[PDB]
Each structure stands twice: as C-alpha cells, then as structure tokens.
Amino acid sequence: SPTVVDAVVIGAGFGGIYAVHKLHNEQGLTVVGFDKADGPGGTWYWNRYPGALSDTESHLYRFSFDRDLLQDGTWKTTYITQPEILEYLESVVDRFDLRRHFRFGTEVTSAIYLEDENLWEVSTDKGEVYRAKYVVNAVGLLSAINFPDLPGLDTFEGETIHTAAWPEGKNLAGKRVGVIGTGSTGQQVITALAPEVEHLTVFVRTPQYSVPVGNRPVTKEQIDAIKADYDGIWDSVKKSAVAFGFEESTLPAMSVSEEERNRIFQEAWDHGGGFRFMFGTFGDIATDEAANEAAASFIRSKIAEIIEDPETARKLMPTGLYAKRPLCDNGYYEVYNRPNVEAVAIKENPIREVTAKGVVTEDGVLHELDVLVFATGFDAVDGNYRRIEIRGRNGLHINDHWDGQPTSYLGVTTANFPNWFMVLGPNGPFTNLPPSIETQVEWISDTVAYAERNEIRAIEPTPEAEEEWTQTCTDIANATLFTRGDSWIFGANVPGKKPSVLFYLGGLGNYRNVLAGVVADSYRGFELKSA
C-alpha cells in the first residue's frame, strides 16, 4: 500500500526547498521531500567546519524570487558564514511552511519507473514506499563525499573528520592537528585552525592560486542602498554570464601596457574576490594562454611577498594554468609564517602509512596527530546519482544510461527517464549558483504545470536532442582552458571516474535564453505522450 503523491523531491538544500515551495504552494500539488540530513540546508547543514564561508557576496547568496523576503534580509559582512546561511535557509522553510512536507533523516535508496502506470516508485532506507508522477532530484553538485583511503587508516588514535561531515560544536583548540587538502575547503579550515591549534601540519600535494577575499563590514546605509535597487541588481545578475554582481570584462590582457595590466590586477586584488580576479579584470584570462600566465605570475609574486621563509614559499608556490575554480582567502598564505605551522610537500616526500598514533612519511618521519582533517573533494555533479538505484524505461539503470560521461538535455533532463528532473545536474550553468538553481526549478515547475494543463502523461527528451546538447557543451568547453585545469570541474579528481565535460559554460544569460526558446518553440527536443 504505497503513498501516492504528485511529486517527490530529493534533497533539502537550496534546490529542494525552492522546488517544494513551487510545486505545493504555487501549483497546489501533493509533494513529499526527503533528505538524509536531520534538517534543511543541504551544503550548509553538512559543512560546519571552521572557516566555512561563501565566495558569493552576501546580498546575492540568497533566493531572489520573493521581493518581501529580499527586503527583510540582514547581514553583517561583505560575505556570509555557514551558520548565517543555514539560519537563512531555515527561515525560508518557516516562512513558507515547508517543514511538514519534508521527511528528514531519510535516504532515498531507489527510484524505479513503472511504465504501465506512468508513475515513479520511490523507496527509502526506512522501509517506506511512495508513488509519484514527477521526481525532482536536487541531490547537490558538490554533495557526494570524496574520502581517499590511506594505508593503515583503519588503525589510528583519534578522530578522522571529512570537512563535509564535521560535527557541530567540535573545537580543536590546544590540540595537534593535521590537514590534508589545499582546495577551497582546506584553505578556509587551515586559516581558521592556525590561531587556535598549537601545531598545524598541512599535507600539501598541489598548491593553488588564491586572491584576498576582502570581507569587509557592511553598514546599515550600505544594505539599504542595495535594497532600494534590488530589481535592477537582480536584472543585471540574471542577464550576466557568472552572476556575481560585478562588471564582467571584455578587455584582452596583453592589449594594454605592462603598467596598466599591473594596475588592473592590483585593483582587483585589493578589492577582493576570486571570480572578480578571473573575470572582472580582463576578458580572456580563461581563454588566452598569455593572459592566463599574466594572471598566474602576478599571484605568484604576491605569494613571494607574503611567505618569508623561501623554502616554505617554494612548497606553497603554485605552478601551471590558472584554470581551477577561483579561490580567495582570509589570510591563507600568512599562516605558514607561524612557528606552529608546518608544510609537507606530499609529492616530494610522500605519505607512506597511517600508524596507530600518527602519519608516517617516506621521510622516515612520523607526525603524531590527535586529529586528521580530510579536506578532500566531492564526487561532483553526478556522484549522488550513481550512489542509488535509479531505473527508467525498460528498467535501464542510471549507470548504464550514463555509461561513459553523465549527460543531460539542458542540464535538467535525461533520455529514457520521463517526468524526472535534475537541479544542477550534468551540463548546467557554471555561475553563482542560487540564481541558476532558481532558473532551473522555475523551468521544472513550469514544465510540470504544462504537463498537468495539457494532459501529458510522460515528457522526456529525444536522444538526438540530448546529443546535440552534449556537443554544444563540448564545443564551448573546448574554447576554454578549464578543460586543462585538472580539477573536479571536469571529473578528474576521483580515481576510477572517467573525465568529461560536466558544465555548460555559456553563462547564465545565454542559458536562460536557451531555456526560453525551448519553451516558446513548444518544448523543442521533447517527446510528449498524451491520454
């Protein structure tokens, strides 16, 4: 005796919160949501590591769809910490009475399409079964935990924390900590842990490029000036490419004098923001090799000013293309001048084994550790889809459908899987994410309503349309240097995972233009089954 509902939503982050609001409050459908978390927040429920903070400016790292909720927003700094975002997202849940629609502490273990009924059968880890005509997957593009295995790790004194599963209230003051990982998460937790711990050991494998964040206090008059121009601010954001609120440059870097190139880089550096350094200074830093090297070397010279010990600056000096997700920090490079901060270059002096009481290097040197923080990445974009049994038409598994690379049509849809939608699924926009999540959930909500109104019982894309979208994303990505960034953005960070394109990099405005032309062209690329 399964529970019948119109729509199932998986995940209670940004995407699920909004999807439950659109499907129930606006369209009046019966909806059930799920999250293995005990409450809402998604990313910001799980990542409670110290230093966790958004690189989207405070006034734009939030929903834009409700004007009253925009005029009630509050914040203290130019950027916003994890406890502030979790609080904001919880406030959205109470504001729209969404809580009662969500089954928390529950994991969706299977999602099986029943063709003869045109219904999805969704079963959970608690034993309950549901049947729905629509399924909306908001399972998170940076959500499936990546946890590398090390020799003898099952045999260790003390705790092993992956940053995306940090226990609330855990403080490491006065302890002896090691951190592995030098991406955005590692930098934040290294910078936050340095003043409190008595010895920090950073196992650095690939040092990265990072600019100052510039997180400045915000006055009431500043907030009010933003609130009285919210419409135009969001209008410009949604028409732009990366949607961070700053003017995106079209000036080629090597077309100006060396002094002007320096002046522009130094202005962004002093202002702050990783995305602004990459896209707000010149227009070809991500597509022109000479422009990219000008940006990379300017950052290197700054790191050489900061880190006094030249041998310490050597291990932390980033080489190669400036083509990973732009990073910014609250004083990351100054940490290594502290006497109680050690850097270990893992590529020269590798990790050999985890002992009972610490980590041994091929140094013939053990580093004792009360705690070992894992600042490693995510099985990004497609990870949380491959972890569960998703079968569509003819019972074809999602892993067999996504045999090689994960694919979509327009980032929100895939073939053989009718009435089945993805928020931040494969081959979607690469922007400030809340306004791209809103764009997707809005199109998904409008597409369900169109099915309900015109009596369609199954919508799904054609293989021809899906392959056309893959090619469109592949051609655009091949015009950039991100394809050679060697990061999670192209699926190169998980061993066993085959690299591929994973993002449409045409920008949010072009993406929204593509979605609107698809709808106006009577859902071009979509097969409709009626009656």
Answer yes or no whether residue 376 interacts with ligand NAP by CB under 6 A: yes
Among 53, 111, 344, 369, binds ligand NAP (CB under 6 A): 53
Please count the residues of this chain forming the interface with ligand FAD, following the rule CB under 6 A: 35
Binding mask 158-197 for ligand FAD (x = CB under 6 A): ---------------------------x------------
Q: Which amino acid makes up residue 348? A: E
Residues 301-360 that bind ligand FAD (CB under 6 A): none
Answer yes or no whether residue 182 interacts with ligand NAP by CB under 6 A: yes
Q: Which amino acid makes up residue 63? A: F
Q: How far is CA 391 from the centre of its chain?
A: 26
Q: Say whether 130 counts as a known binding-site residue.
A: no
Among 5, 20, 22, 42, binds ligand FAD (CB under 6 A): 42
Residues 58-87 that bind ligand FAD (CB under 6 A): 61
Measure the CA–CA gap between 279 and 508, rounded to whole angstroms: 14
User: Is the dihedral angle over the CA atoms 35, 326, 212, 318 positive or is it negative?
Assistant: positive
| 186, two tokens | 């590692």
Q: Kindly indicate which of the ranges 134-142, 168-176, 213-221, 295-303 contains the residues binding ligand FAD, using the contact rule CB under 6 A.
A: 134-142
User: Is the dihedral angle over the CA atoms 244, 140, 149, 200 positive or is it negative?
Assistant: positive
Among 7, 29, 37, 237, binds ligand FAD (CB under 6 A): 37
Residues 371-400 that bind ligand FAD (CB under 6 A): 384, 388
Binding mask 485-524 for ligand FAD (x = CB under 6 A): ----------------------------------------
Q: How far is CA 429 from the centre of its chain?
A: 11
Bridge-based pairing of strands 119-124 and 129-137 is antiparallel
Q: Say whether 206 counts as a known binding-site residue.
A: yes
Measure the CA–CA gap between 56 and 431, rounded to whole angstroms: 10
Nearest alpha-carbon partner for 501 in 480, 481, 477: 477
Answer yes or no whether residue 279 interacts with ligand NAP by CB under 6 A: no
Among 19, 54, 333, 469, binds ligand NAP (CB under 6 A): 54
Answer yes or no whether residue 410 interacts with ligand FAD by CB under 6 A: no
User: Is the dihedral angle over the CA atoms 177, 180, 181, 185 positive or is it negative?
Assistant: negative
Q: What are phi and psi of 32, to 5 degrees?
A: -125, 135
Binding mask 113-152 for ligand NAP (x = CB under 6 A): -----------------------------x-----x----
Give which of ligand FAD, ligand NAP, none residue 148 binds (C-beta under 5 to 8 Å, depending on kind): ligand NAP
Judge whether 111 and 388 are in contact, CB under 8 Å. yes
With 0-12 CB in 10 A as exposed, 13-18 as middle and 19+ as buried, what is 270? exposed
Answer yes or no whether residue 422 interacts with ligand FAD by CB under 6 A: no
Give which of ligand FAD, ligand NAP, none residue 325 binds (C-beta under 5 to 8 Å, depending on kind): ligand NAP
Residue with smaller CB distance to ligand NAP, 323 or 456: 323
Q: How far is CA 53 from CA 47, 60, 210, 213, in A?
A: 10, 14, 15, 10
Q: Kindly indicate which of the ranges 28-36, 49-57, 94-102, 305-313 contains the residues binding ligand NAP, using the contact rule CB under 6 A.
A: 49-57
Burial string for 111-144 (b: 16+ CB within 10 Å, else e) reads bebeeeeebbbbbbeeeeebebbbbbbbbbbbbb
Residue with smaller CB distance to ligand FAD, 15 or 485: 15
Answer yes or no whether residue 440 interacts with ligand FAD by CB under 6 A: no
Q: Say whether 488 counts as a known binding-site residue.
A: yes
Q: How far is CA 250 from CA 198, 255, 279, 512, in A?
A: 47, 11, 9, 21
Nearest alpha-carbon partner for 313 in 283, 286, 334, 291: 334
Give which of ligand NAP, ligand FAD, none residue 186 binds (C-beta under 5 to 8 Å, depending on kind): ligand NAP
Question: At closest approach, how far in Å is the CB of 107 from ligand NAP?
Answer: 22
Answer yes or no whether residue 15 interacts with ligand FAD by CB under 6 A: yes
Measure the CA–CA gap between 453 and 391, rounded to whole angstroms: 27
Q: Which amino acid makes up residue 196? A: E
Answer yes or no whether residue 437 interacts with ligand FAD by CB under 6 A: yes
Measure the CA–CA gap between 402 and 195, rounded to whole angstroms: 46
Where is the binding site for FAD, in residues? 15, 35, 43, 46, 55-56, 61, 108, 433
Residue numbers of the site for ligand NAP (CB under 6 A)? 53-55, 142, 148, 180-186, 188, 205-206, 325, 375-377, 488, 493
Interface positions with ligand FAD (CB under 6 A): 10-16, 34-37, 42-43, 45, 47, 52, 54-56, 61, 107-108, 138-140, 142-143, 185, 384, 388, 423-424, 432-433, 437
